[PDB]
RNA sequence: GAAGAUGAUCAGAUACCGUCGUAGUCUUAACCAUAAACUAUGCCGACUAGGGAUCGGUUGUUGUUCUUUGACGCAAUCGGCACCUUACGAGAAAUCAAAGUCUUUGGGUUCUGGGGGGAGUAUGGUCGCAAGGCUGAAACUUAAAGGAAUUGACGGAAG
């Protein structure tokens, strides 16, 4: 009980100065307090995608630890992914959720073909790589759901994507690399310059600049 | 040896744009190179470019504006029928709403969207987006 | 066994095979 | 990006690098936002009134940010005869 | 066991004991 | 543009050459090439101090844009520059970082001296490498005093000067403090003589 | 592989398994009725043990 | 340039080289050599009839230890001799 | 050896950062003070803490100690290092009244609109 | 895997280097690969440099040095501690000690 | 110095070590055509990044020594043998200025591989005086074999 922010960003979120995560993203501000994500995205649902047991050989024998993989998202364009190791699974899952929240990125939903209704798919073909695993996301028409393996399908669902084709290459059974590659891929949508984004936008002042006194100390 | 001067031109453009440079030197020039750049310039993917006469094949200096994701050639210049253009645009372009496949048709060099408008087809030459 | 000596064993045994077939030439 | 009815269905129109025009991603933490004060005719800094430039972490990573600011500021009049177009 | 298997189920099984002991000590005493 | 009162005056130019500011390292990297005027026959490279002055004026204008003066961090790991940054912080209200920079001061939020500066200013990219690296993790712009061998990676504003001079370091810091205060209006105009002497900001040996 | 061996022990376990007759249990419903039975058992009267849901819980 | 010809008139080289290289697929080799037809005891058939020659029994591999109870069968269609396992607890007593 | 441990080294230096005005250079006086300042479980640790605290106090009077930061050593130091000579050693009065820059640097000076007297020096 | 980028020798832009015999074990070793030490040692041990000068019939006669170039193969040199096993990162250091 | 013989060592030692020693080693005419024949990395062309050295050539220029020209020094450049830093970029990693410009997938072109064994075996052909070279299967068997790196353990390796 009782959260005391330790960062400038946390203080600005503790006061009603910053009310959405898109203000965080506009200035690429680093997030270090999970309470920021809880306040701005109150309705988050998590899912423990995989649990693995890793062992470290010692002089007498193995010292076993538990590795947890957690996927977080709001099903409306924001998604995160966390992997953390601890002695116990319950503490590992709880801590993996925290760092999954800290890494939450926005995604661009777009239209396959006509722009009728709300965006339902990706705006362009994207690809991500981690290890040997390469995950490719292709925009899909409104009928096909998530054409992906159950591991990749869950990441897409929590991000709010309705319509997408998928193709993966490499050792997809390495679950951590597959999710990390897809997380990088889904985040590249806000890295791909499209002609509708060609317009130059003015650089607004950072929220850390306009509210300097509330973040002082 | 030098088997495709358009590939050399686009390779120089790709390497300069990815490294953030706003200008690139291309050698040698050609009519196809100039017309490929003109199509790119018409859609805003490059800026002004300059042809330098050296009493030889020539050189070109192109101004880059950072909007270019990728331009490339298709070697060889495959023959493309009109019913095959849909398959080519699906494979090469990032989406159905932007990007262009450049063709050389007997009606001239043009993007696949202009090619659909004038109902012509030729050999595939490259792409840009 | 060593790859070099395995080859020598087979070369000497191929040598034997060649000599054995020549009987019925 | 906007839908058929014209509503801006896009959330978070991102910033772009002033030097290379690349999109500055939401987690590009090597990217910075330079704020430069305006100066009145008395030699005094004008309060809360700035020229702003943004650089992606890529430009800063190549070590070209310094020469890019020399060019970018000189075109905006913030500098004189420090950056040369022709080398 | 390979997996953490029931790891916490053992703890959630552990927890009715504290609520049962606070409640057990809260009764007799009330009527002691 | 800029009023002519902001031009390099002859007085400041005398200070810069007497403090050996114009002496740049023998070997120059490609990114510092615009700042070299000509190479001196011994091997030293002559710094175009006209460019040095404008970067100083440009740097002071960026410093003046930070709202909280304590949010500006001035750093120096070289012993020749340690005295300069402590006095600069006192005069301007900035936060000085002299000597060792504790790794994790910008990224680890449970450390003792955990800061969130809006701007980091560096005396030398070579000897202050640790401070510059962490700034590229938390979106901190970097202003650096650069010699001809100083790296320019993750350096936005480079001040061409002599980083390896006992007198060179103090003068550039003294000049910034005077100009930063001039913009704030503390100094009435660009002609009033400052009470502080450039001798202050200079390193003193334990002898004295 | 050396292959041989006495064949006298063929069928040992199945022969010595004690025969148990099936209790004459009520027939289970067939066709559309059986799909109806499974649906209620899994989504109408949920028997979950506070997030622990088992189709065939052994008595424990 | 990826080490293979790309020219528009090099289709024969691509077709022949691929034809040469599918021989590295053993599944493909067995289909064209007709190895099931020539070497397989069934001759490519799914099933085959035979006459029981003897009840014998095969010792299992490590780390397992058991007597796998099989029979020796001579196929009617071609006279070839194979060993066939007799599944389930005690079905060897059904085979004479 | 007589190497003090960490439970006594860090606990003693917390006292200096917290109770420097009340401390002193005498162990006997220091020994009595820590019995009312800290809760020490054993007598032997109380003398050990005071014996190293006294040593640190004896070391602070000889100069600044590492690891102890309080509130009067540094406040006195900011204006302690104010020494400045009457002549600037950078003022052009040590020389004849003009710069001694090398002739190559003088060309840069000539390029700018400045007329400053110079005695060119050619080290070569 | 590949342990050293130089393959333990000094052969680049060359096909073959003629061998030399190790001083210690007489193993044939290529000249670029051999561990080479230049030694300039005094011909007389420091204990005997005084009495030999007094017994000398020449006033102020300088004792000659003993010049020798030693060639070792890899097994002899490692065995004789001429070179030692270094860490993976310390192997790259090739300045003289 | 293969072979062979011999003195030692060892439980045994045909060997390591020691002593003799024939082919061979060298050369002339012919054969052979194989090597971890290695950069385990095809060739041609373009581009992408900095630095200090060096070899060959050319062009501008010295507080240096020398005949009585030549040497050295400083800059540019083309080409090389290499080397150092970084990683825009690649990779499973070790690592790579190419092993980069590869789902944002197409510069030209030659050769090779398709789980591990059986196997470079049998057979046919062909070259060779021979040893052998080149071409080259199948039956059958098998759930792994293998690459890089990590922790530990061990080592008649170093500190
Ligand atoms: Mg841990
Ligand atoms: Mg990108
Ligand atoms: Mg589409
Ligand atoms: Mg289209
Ligand atoms: Mg970084
Ligand atoms: Mg097989
Ligand atoms: Mg102690
Ligand atoms: Mg090895
Ligand atoms: Mg050669
Ligand atoms: Mg060789
Ligand atoms: Mg030597
Ligand atoms: Mg013998
Ligand atoms: Mg021949
Ligand atoms: Mg190869
Ligand atoms: Mg595909
Ligand atoms: Mg065989
Ligand atoms: Mg291995
Ligand atoms: Zn040897």
From Swiss-Prot, chain C:
GO terms for cellular component: cytoplasm; ribonucleoprotein complex; ribosome. Residues 1-25 are annotated as: Disordered. One of its GO terms (biological process) is translation. Pfam families: Ribosomal_L41. Keywords: Cytoplasm, Ribonucleoprotein, Ribosomal protein. One of its GO terms (molecular function) is structural constituent of ribosome. It is found in: Cytoplasm. Initially thought to be part of the large ribosomal subunit. Crystal structures show eS32/eL41 to be a small ribosomal subunit forming a bridge at the interface of the 2 subunits. Component of the small ribosomal subunit. Mature ribosomes consist of a small (40S) and a large (60S) subunit. The 40S subunit contains about 32 different proteins and 1 molecule of RNA (18S). The 60S subunit contains 45 different proteins and 3 molecules of RNA (25S, 5.8S and 5S). Belongs to the eukaryotic ribosomal protein eS32 family. Component of the ribosome, a large ribonucleoprotein complex responsible for the synthesis of proteins in the cell. The small ribosomal subunit (SSU) binds messenger RNAs (mRNAs) and translates the encoded message by selecting cognate aminoacyl-transfer RNA (tRNA) molecules. The large subunit (LSU) contains the ribosomal catalytic site termed the peptidyl transferase center (PTC), which catalyzes the formation of peptide bonds, thereby polymerizing the amino acids delivered by tRNAs into a polypeptide chain. This is Small ribosomal subunit protein eS32.
Swiss-Prot record, chain D:
One of its GO terms (molecular function) is structural constituent of ribosome. InterPro entries: Ribosomal_eS21, Ribosomal_eS21_CS, Ribosomal_eS21_sf. This is Small ribosomal subunit protein eS21. Its main location: cytoplasm. Gene3D superfamilies: 3.30.1230.20. Required for the processing of the 20S rRNA-precursor to mature 18S rRNA in a late step of the maturation of 40S ribosomal subunits. Has a physiological role leading to 18S rRNA stability. PROSITE patterns: RIBOSOMAL_S21E (PS00996).
From Swiss-Prot, chain E:
It comes from the Eukaryota. Phosphorylation by TORC1 upon nutrient replenishment inhibits STM1 and causes its release from dormant ribosomes. Residues 10-31 have a biased composition (Acidic residues). It is found in: Cytoplasm. Ribosome preservation factor that protect a small pool of nontranslating, vacant ribosomes in cells under nutrient starvation conditions. Under nutrient-limiting conditions, cells reduce ribosome biogenesis and degrade ribosomes via autophagy (ribophagy) or proteasomal degradation. To avoid excessive degradation during starvation, STM1 binds to and protects 80S ribosomes from proteasomal degradation. Under nutrient-sufficient conditions, TORC1 phosphorylates and inhibits STM1 to prevent formation of dormant 80S ribosomes. Associates with mature 80S ribosomes. Binds to the head domain of the 40S ribosomal subunit and prevents mRNA binding by inserting its alpha-helix domain towards the mRNA entry tunnel at the decoding site, where it blocks the binding of tRNA and mRNA at the A- and P-sites. Interacts with eEF2; interaction sequesters eEF2 at the A-site of the ribosome, thereby blocking the interaction sites of the mRNA-tRNA complex, promoting ribosome stabilization and hibernation. Belongs to the STM1 family. This is Ribosome-associated protein STM1. It comes from Candida albicans (strain SC5314 / ATCC MYA-2876) (Yeast). The gene is STM1.
UniProtKB/Swiss-Prot annotation, chain G:
Its main location: cytoplasm. GO terms for biological process: translation. Keywords: Cytoplasm, Ribonucleoprotein, Ribosomal protein. Residues 1-32 are annotated as: Disordered. It is found in: Cytoplasm. GO terms for molecular function: structural constituent of ribosome. InterPro entries: Ribosomal_eS30. Pfam families: Ribosomal_S30. One of its GO terms (cellular component) is cytosolic small ribosomal subunit. Belongs to the eukaryotic ribosomal protein eS30 family. Component of the small ribosomal subunit. Mature ribosomes consist of a small (40S) and a large (60S) subunit. The 40S subunit contains about 32 different proteins and 1 molecule of RNA (18S). The 60S subunit contains 45 different proteins and 3 molecules of RNA (25S, 5.8S and 5S). PANTHER family: 40S RIBOSOMAL PROTEIN S30/UBIQUITIN-LIKE PROTEIN FUBI (PTHR12650), RIBOSOMAL PROTEIN S30, ISOFORM A (PTHR12650:SF15). Component of the ribosome, a large ribonucleoprotein complex responsible for the synthesis of proteins in the cell. The small ribosomal subunit (SSU) binds messenger RNAs (mRNAs) and translates the encoded message by selecting cognate aminoacyl-transfer RNA (tRNA) molecules. The large subunit (LSU) contains the ribosomal catalytic site termed the peptidyl transferase center (PTC), which catalyzes the formation of peptide bonds, thereby polymerizing the amino acids delivered by tRNAs into a polypeptide chain. This is Small ribosomal subunit protein eS30. It comes from Candida albicans (strain SC5314 / ATCC MYA-2876) (Yeast).
